Each structure stands twice: as C-alpha cells, then as structure tokens.
C-alpha cells in the first residue's frame, strides 16, 4: 500500500501540533525530524514538521525532507496570521504539490458567516501564489475536542463522534485531493557509473546502482557526462551479483556491457540513461547550504570566483561560483542561491542533488534549481 509524506505549517497557537496528534489516535481505531505515522485504508503516511523556513529549506537540500503535500492549520477564531503569507510563500518556493486546509477551533465561533469569510481570505491568499485556492478543500473542525474524545474512547470510530467525523472529512480530503507520488521504476531509465573494465571476449563493462527506470537487454542507451559528446549504443547484457538478470530496475546494484564501446570510452562519474532523457551542461543555478565550521565546514567565508569540488553522484568536478546581486560574501551555515560554471559538461537536471568539497572534505551541499548553459 502506497506511502506518502505530508507536513503541517501554520501558527503553533492554532493547534497544528494538536491536529497532528488527533490524526494518529483517530485512524488508530480503524487500522491496527522526530516524525509520527498513521495510515488510512488507501495509503500510509509519515508527518513532517515545518518550524523554520530556513531550517526546513536546509533539509530539503540535504535530501532529508520531501513533502508530497501539506496541510495548512489556521484558527477560524483568529483567521489568517500575517505570517500565513510567509508560510505559503515557503510552499511555493520548495514547490509543494498540493495543499489542504483545516480550519481549527471552529467550536469557538458562534456566527457561521465569519467562517465563510475567514475561508474567503485564505482561498484568495493561495491564489496569490499559484495555488488553486478555489479547488482546495477546506475542512472545519476542532483538533482539541476530536482528541479529547479519542482519549476517552481510543476505539472511537467513523460516524460515532461529531468532531472525529470532521477529522475524517480531512483524512479523506487528503487521500483524494492529494495526488499520490509518481513512483520511481516508472520514470525514464538512469544509472550512475562507478567502475568500468572488461571481461575478455565479452566487451567493456560498467557497474552501478540504477537510480530510476527499468532496463533489459537490447535496450538502446546513451552515455552522458565528462566526454565532449554524448555517445549512444545498445545494451548487450545485464547481470546482478554476477548472475544474469531478466530486467534491472531502480534500486538494483548491476553491471552492463555495451556495443561499440572501448574500455577507454567509459569510466566512473559518467552516467547512462534513456536516450534524449537528460542532457549535458556546464552553467546552472542552485540552492545550497554551507556547512558550519563545527559541522566540519569551512573556517571562513568566500566570494564570487570560488573554485571548489562538486560531487555529482560518482564524480567530483571543478567549477566557479558566481554570487548574485545582493549577495557579497558567504559564510559557514548560510543558505544561498548562486550560479555555477564547471570545467567539463555533466548530465544535469533540475532537482539533482550534489555536494561540495575542498580536498575530500565536504564543505557544502546543494541541489540544482535551474539549467542555464
């Protein structure tokens, strides 16, 4: 059964913390970071938490976080908070797939016209940032009461309690509205080359763990990276743990030989994937995070022109930083966005993570946000 990552953002005094706890206890009576887990009939969930714009944004880079969707918690009694703009702003930035809303503390408001209003506000607010403010589902309830009830009756179920039914209305909204992630093996093929040698009479062979997609024999492939040109041939065999394989799929530690490929024509760092799928580049934009001195990062800061190492999977290529206008110097611990240019072309794509180092020592780590040249 499918797995998904969801997070909670919004003012803390609005109960996002309480709502999280209510969701666990409520589904418990139907299905036997420091994240929490809970599952519906359809999927399984893990809860992320967004306390910091930076804090989070940092982790989104170090591979840690990966919200497939998020829940917005606003108190119907107060209505949106100025920061609410900033909460949403983050989502836009990291680009959360979709958002769902939960108007908490609805029991502390007599007039139901205000509620329609509060909702009116929020709806528009999201529209301001490309989100389908109208298409988004807005649940009204009270996390507190829903929880107090689950505390009294841990086995409470659907239809029984009024406030718990609202929590379900929400759980349901998630299942639906929320697109389910797009699986890996379904994505175009790709594998990072680690080693390359030969097996006399067989041909030139290259090992590595498949990252995404599938691949059998006779399949047509491309060798992107390092070289002046992207060579392309065809697979002449697959084999796991040195024992022929039917098909190799994402997550498989494999090895592959190619047709019309000398031993000198391929090596570690390079990468092979579905033809036309990804291309080689040298200039790009990226969001980074510099390790503090304690985390073993640099001791001082640096400026435009910095020329370090960027570990891209198996490789470790050289390039020069270009701090943008407004950014004059960068210090350890910083979160930044600058352009970069490398000496040799590399298979690059938005979203691609990497690392930086000064002689093996990792000093920073980021992810590609835009391709330029």
């Amino acid at each position: 059964k499918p797995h998904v990552n969801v997070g909670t953002i919004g003012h803390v005094d609005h109960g996002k913390t309480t709502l999280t706890a209510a969701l666990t206890y409520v589904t418990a009576a139907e299905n036997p970071t420091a994240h929490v887990e809970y599952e519906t009939a359809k999927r399984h969930y893990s809860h992320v938490d967004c306390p910091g714009h930076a804090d989070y944004i940092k982790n989104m880079i170090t591979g840690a976080a990966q919200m497939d969707g998020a829940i917005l918690v606003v108190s119907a009694a107060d209505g949106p908070m100025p920061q609410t703009r900033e909460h949403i702003l983050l989502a836009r930035q990291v680009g959360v797939p979709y958002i769902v809303v939960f108007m908490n503390k609805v029991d502390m408001v007599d007039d139901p016209e205000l509620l329609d209003l509060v909702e009116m506000e929020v709806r528009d607010l999201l529209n301001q940032y490309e989100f389908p403010g109208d298409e988004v589902p807005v649940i009204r309830g009270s996390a507190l009461l829903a929880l107090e009830q689950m505390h009294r009756n841990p086995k409470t179920r659907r239809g029984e309690n009024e406030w718990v039914d609202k929590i379900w209305e929400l759980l349901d909204a998630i299942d639906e509205y929320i697109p389910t992630p797009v699986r890996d093996v379904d994505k175009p093929f790709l594998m990072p080359v680690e080693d390359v040698f030969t097996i006399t009479g067989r041909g030139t062979v290259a090992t590595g763990r498949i990252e995404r997609g599938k691949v059998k024999v006779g399949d047509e492939v491309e060798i992107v990276g390092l070289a002046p040109e992207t060579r392309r041939t065809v697979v002449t065999g697959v084999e796991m743990h040195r024992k022929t394989l039917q098909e190799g799929i994402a997550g498989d530690n494999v090895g592959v030989l190619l047709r019309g490929v000398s031993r000198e024509e391929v090596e570690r760092g390079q990468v092979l994937a579905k033809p036309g799928s990804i291309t080689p580049h040298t200039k790009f934009e990226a969001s980074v995070y510099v390790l503090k001195k304690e985390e073993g990062g640099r001791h001082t800061g640096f400026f435009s022109g910095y020329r370090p190492q960027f570990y891209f999977r198996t490789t470790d290529v050289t390039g020069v930083v270009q701090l943008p206008p407004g950014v004059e110097m960068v210090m350890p611990g910083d979160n930044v966005t600058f352009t970069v240019e490398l000496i040799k072309p590399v298979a690059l794509e938005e979203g691609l993570r990497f690392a930086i180092r000064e002689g093996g020592r990792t000093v920073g780590a980021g992810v590609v946000t835009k391709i330029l040249e």
């Binding site: 910091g52 107060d78 209505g79 100025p82 920061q83 900033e86 408001v109 205000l114």
Partner: protein, 195 residues
C-alpha cells in the same frame, strides 16, 4: 455593517476575526470604540507571551542619509517565518530609525542596576530637600521625576518617534498582537560621528 465593518476593520488592525466581532459587539458597532478596544486588548495578549522564548529574528539597521549616524538592532521573534514578514521587517526598520534619533541608553527598565539607579536617585532628593519642602515631600516629589528620566534613557519607555502619542513598548505590543509571537529587543548599537 456585518463582516463588512469587521472586514474593513480587521483589514486595518490585522487582528483576530472573532476578536474583531467581539469588540464591535463589546462596544457597540462603532469603529472608534472598537479599534481602541482592539488596541487596548492587544496590550494583554502581549504580556501573555512576555516570557516565551525568541531566538529567531533579524538584525535591523538604520544609516542616516548623511552617514553620520548608524544603528544596529537585534529583533527576535519565535519563528523565522515571522522574521521574514513585512511587518517584522518594518517594525525593525522603524525601531532602528527611532534609536538613531532618540539615542536610548537601555532597552528595558530592569536593564538598570541598583548601585547605578541609586547613585542617581539620591542626587534627585539632594536638590529637592533644598528648594523648600523637606524629605517627606521631596521623596514623593522624586516619584514622578524618575518617570521622566526613564522616558528618556529607556528605549521601551520612549515616546515613539513617528507618533509621540504612543510609547515604544506599545508599538511592539501592538505588533505581537497581530502576529502571535513574543517579540523582543535583544540589544542595540548606535554610532554618531565624533560622538
């Protein structure tokens, strides 16, 4: 009217949708006795988070147009989300500017030690015991003569530079109200050329 009065209103005071209605009812449906209610009520919310922790925030600054005076100011909030908010931003810019002009010596009152306050407080009753009324009268004489002093040297007690009608602290409390996060002034720095 209905949410139209409340709207236009909260729209301005940026407060709690329900707290807005509450105040319109609570004081007849007239803005003046409402916004002033909201302001007055906000002052309370402030004192509630008064001891909440705040290590987030930014460093505000003000550099006079003639570069002869510069000010640094650490403004902390609870979450960096808030820190990034236009309101926090402005409050900070405005606080820095204020300091530049008002030149406070302390942030808050408690920031003031005893031996210090005393070495002073008596220089107060020293000249009072002279021009007439002895100690008893001069002890209560030097009761309001201190309030004035604090309004001078203490940042919080100073009358806001963009509205002498409200004290700095108030300006802050007001913000806290519309945001919901304790907001504190950690420290400030002020350089005036050749001074």
């Amino acid at each position: 009217s209905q949410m139209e009065l409340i709207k236009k209103l909260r729209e301005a005071t940026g407060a709690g949708m329900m707290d807005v209605k509450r105040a319109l009812e609570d004081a007849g449906w007239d803005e003046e006795k409402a916004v002033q209610l909201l302001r007055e009520r906000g002052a309370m919310k402030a004192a509630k988070k008064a001891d909440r922790e705040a290590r987030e925030g930014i460093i505000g600054h003000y550099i006079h147009h003639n570069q002869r005076v510069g000010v640094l100011v650490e403004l902390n909030c609870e979450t960096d989300f808030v820190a990034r908010n236009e309101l926090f931003q402005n409050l900070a810019k405005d606080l820095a500017m204020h300091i530049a002009m008002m030149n406070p010596r302390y942030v808050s009152a408690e920031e003031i030690p005893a031996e210090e306050l005393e070495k002073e407080r008596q220089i107060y009753i020293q000249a009072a015991l002279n021009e007439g009324k002895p100690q008893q009268i001069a002890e209560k004489i030097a009761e309001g003569r201190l309030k004035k002093y604090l309004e001078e040297v203490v940042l919080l007690e100073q009358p806001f530079v963009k509205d002498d009608k409200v004290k700095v602290k108030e300006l802050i409390q007001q913000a806290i109200a519309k945001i919901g996060e304790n907001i504190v002034v950690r420290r400030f720095c002020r350089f005036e050329l050749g001074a």
